[PDB]
Ligand binder design. Structure first.
Ligand SMILES: [Ca+2]
Ligand SMILES: [Ca+2]
Ligand SMILES: [Ca+2]
Ligand SMILES: [Ca+2]
Ligand SMILES: [Cu+]
Length: 316
């Protein structure tokens, strides 16, 4: 919409108060003109036609229950924008300040969120397995990262390339969480998963096996469910990313951790410069090793730790 830039206030899914950038033109819209070509949040109104209607509010205050998923989708889309721009010098997901669109209240009781090729989509959860999924900053950044991957490496969403696709979204989803520095962890989805059960998550990067995902190549799933296990075998790469950043000893192989920023630098580089749509795990190792070499030198610790971490999870 054409209008003037304003700042509204409301509460997110977890009941936290936050300011949001809006656009006033009779109504106040969830349209943030301060980031690239804009961040736009829509109401799917419990239906599945997308994107639905640009979110409109009469008084620029967003504290209703119904408002909360929109407030967080909007706000966390902005935090993710800020991460990519400030940390990687990347302007939106296409690198050219593409408008970021999100729809909330998608369908009824929908326990999921996704990037559909064009925009982000968030279910409200059934209230049991999930509460509105835009309440999780790692979920929002995971999904937006699929757009980044789609515009860069273009990893095909199947088999090893798809598990790499998934881990990349888990990796930057988590780095955005740390960036916002609000209860950050190496778990995925903990802020919106199973409100009746504390301490669990969708997946874990630091120990994928805690939810049955493999933490070594030898345990890879080789069936054809989940598109060949993209959300399953992602644990093997998630674990390596974790070790590269935080270090440790896994199945007897020790990894010297080099911290989150260098992890993010190495994986960003690999994603944008070396991975291709059909890259497998082995090719990811090569890409990350060359990225580190590019960045820190062939004889660096950084290179050694990337090698150690991939060794630790069995991928050569
Ligand atoms: Ca209002
Ligand atoms: Ca957290
Ligand atoms: Ca998390
Ligand atoms: Ca829970
Ligand atoms: Cu995903």
């Amino acid at each position: 919409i054409t209008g003037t830039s304003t700042v509204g206030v409301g509460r997110g899914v977890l009941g936290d108060q936050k300011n949001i950038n809006t656009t006033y033109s009779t109504y106040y819209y969830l349209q943030d003109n301060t980031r690239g070509d804009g961040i736009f949040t829509y109401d799917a109104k419990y239906r599945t036609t997308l994107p639905g209607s640009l979110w409109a509010d009469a008084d620029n205050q967003f504290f209703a229950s119904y408002d909360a998923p929109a407030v967080d989708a909007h706000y966390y889309a902005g935090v993710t924008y800020d991460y990519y721009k400030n940390v990687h010098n990347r302007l939106s997901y296409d690198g050219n300040n593409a408008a970021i669109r999100s729809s909330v209240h998608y369908s009824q009781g929908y326990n999921n969120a996704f990037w559909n090729g064009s925009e982000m989509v968030y279910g409200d959860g059934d209230g049991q397995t999930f509460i509105p999924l835009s309440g999780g900053i790692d979920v929002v950044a995971h999904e937006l990262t699929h757009a980044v991957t789609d515009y860069t490496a273009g990893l095909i969403y199947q088999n090893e390339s798809g598990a790499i696709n998934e881990a990349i979204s888990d990796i930057f989803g988590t780095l955005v969480e740390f960036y916002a520095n609000k209860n950050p962890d190496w778990e995925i989805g903990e802020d919106v998963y199973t409100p009746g059960i504390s301490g669990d998550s969708l997946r874990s990067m630091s120990d994928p096996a805690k939810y049955g995902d493999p933490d070594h190549y030898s345990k890879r799933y080789t069936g054809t469910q989940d598109n060949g296990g993209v959300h399953i075998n992602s644990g093997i790469i998630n674990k390596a990313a974790y070790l590269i950043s935080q270090g440790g000893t896994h199945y007897g192989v020790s990894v010297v951790g080099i911290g989150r920023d260098k992890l993010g630098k190495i994986f960003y580089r690999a994603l944008t410069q070396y991975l291709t749509p059909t890259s497998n795990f082995s090719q990811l190792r090569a890409a990350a090793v060359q990225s580190a070499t590019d960045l820190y030198g062939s004889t660096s610790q950084e290179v050694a730790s990337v090698k150690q971490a991939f060794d630790a999870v069995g991928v050569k």
